[model samples]
Target chain A: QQQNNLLRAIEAQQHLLQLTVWGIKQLQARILAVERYLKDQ
Target chain B: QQQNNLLRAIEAQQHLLQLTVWGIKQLQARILAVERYLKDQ
Candidate 1:
């Protein structure tokens, strides 16, 4: 039972990290958009 | 047992959201830095 709980905790942390990666990617997209706008001006 | 597992899952998801928020903040900081550099030039 304890081992199962430990495994679940690890999986949860990995899932969280994956979410963080997605968020960073979205942020990068916005940054690129702003950069393009500034350069065009 | 099932209820406890469900609760853990919810907590894990919340943690993921918090991490995502932090990542967005970091990205914004970088965007600001880039904007400032572009403006200075």
Candidate 2:
């Protein structure tokens, strides 16, 4: 039961990490867009 | 001059964030594969 719980926790953590990665990617793209805009100005 | 430096810094940070996102995604996929293996066992 403890092992199963640990596995579940790991799975949940992995999901969170995945979400964080996606968020970072989104932010990175936004920053890149801003940089491009600044360059164009 | 300060604004120009700030824009460059933002671009650098964005590049680092992109790398981090890619790293996280690679780890997430690895974890998923591990989860599948455990399920098969």
Candidate 3:
């Protein structure tokens, strides 16, 4: 039983992006912290 | 809307990989700049 495919994959990809965006925000915070520490020193 | 979730995951992974490469390049640039600054100091 085949089905409509491409749209589904794109939607899933969108969801995955949501997760990654969260992670990226965390990464951004960490990177900024390091930069600040170096600048302050 | 039901669809091929795995294919969507793969597409998301590919997109994420592209973004990751960009992030890695930015990180490498920052590291190189720091190395150069330290060498000059």
Candidate 4:
């Protein structure tokens, strides 16, 4: 492996982190809304 | 170096994970709030 593997991992972590967070939030919010409606009914 | 580079990998993973989690929470909150407002109106 090249020395840059470390750098690539770092970059991947950053990119994936951003994407994951964004995705999770969307998922969570939908869950929340559904939950709220369910609870109210 | 040790096998799997676990130490550094985990360190980097933790940092990236935190950033991802935080960003996701922020985005999710925003989205949920918007949805809530829309639903309420």
Candidate 5:
């Protein structure tokens, strides 16, 4: 448990990027979902 | 011009943002394309 200004800057950047990161996660899922397109076979 | 530095900064940010800006344009198109679906009638 340790975070001051410098450390918090790391956290701030991580927060900034997490939304971007999640889209990467979602894009990974979406690509697989596209490949799974079987018209609900 | 009076805003040389600030204007350049504005242009720099615009260049940074245009890629993101184009996706908004694409998403707007994608939404309309979805609504136009009707399986091409």
Candidate 6:
């Protein structure tokens, strides 16, 4: 309804993006571990 | 500098979020394939 709404939405998305990237990084680490497992075997 | 700047910034973030999700989904598919490969072996 107002600029505050847009500001809130933007900040919420920035937070969501931060959390999303954190999850992505965790998955990346897991994938690397699996890759290492395959190579080490 | 003004409200327009805020509006543009928000729009840019929204675009970035969309792009980020797209990349995440791509990684998700690849990870699934890797899992499948390990299981199929």
Candidate 5 regions exceeding 4 Å error are: A1-3, A38-41, B1-41
DockQ of every candidate: 0.24, 0.04, 0.23, 0.18, 0.05, 0.38
- Alpha-carbon RMSD, candidate 2: 21.4
On lDDT, the leading prediction is 6
For candidate 6, give fnat to 2 decimals: 0.30
lDDT of 6 by residue, B1-41 (tens): 57778788888878888888888888878888888888899
Give the lowest summed-lDDT range of ten residues in model 3 chain B: B1-10
User: Model 1: per-residue lDDT, tens digit, A1-41?
Assistant: 87578668768777767877876998788888887887788
**What 10-residue stretch in candidate 1 chain B is worst by lDDT?**
B1-10
For model 6, state the Cα shift of residue A17 in Å.
0.9
Clashing pairs in 4: none
TM-score of the B chain in each candidate versus the native B chain? 0.80, 0.94, 0.73, 0.74, 0.52, 0.84
lDDT by residue (A7-36, candidate 6, tens digit) is 787789979889778869977996997889
Could you estimate the TM-score for every candidate? 0.56, 0.51, 0.50, 0.48, 0.39, 0.78
Residues B1-41, candidate 5, lDDT per residue (tens digit)?
A: 54455456545655645565565556556544643563354
lDDT of 2 at A26: 65
> After superposing candidate 3, which stretches have Cα over 4 Å from the reference?
A1-3, B1-21, B31-41
RMSD (Cα, Å) for all candidates, in order, is 7.4, 21.4, 5.4, 8.2, 8.6, 2.2
Q: Identify the candidate with maximal DockQ.
A: 6
Residues A1-41, model 3: lDDT tens digits? 34446556566767877786677667667767777887999
**Residue by residue across B1-41, what tens digits does model 2's lDDT show?**
65556556556655765677787667656655755665576
Error of 2 at B12 (Å): 0.1
Ranking by lDDT: 6, 1, 4, 3, 2, 5
Question: lDDT, candidate 1, residue A4?
Answer: 71
lDDT over C-alpha atoms for residue A7 of model 3: 58
- Poorest lDDT segment (10 consecutive residues) of candidate 2 chain A: A1-10
Model 3: per-residue Cα lDDT over B1-41, one tens digit each: 24456556677678887896687677667767766877898
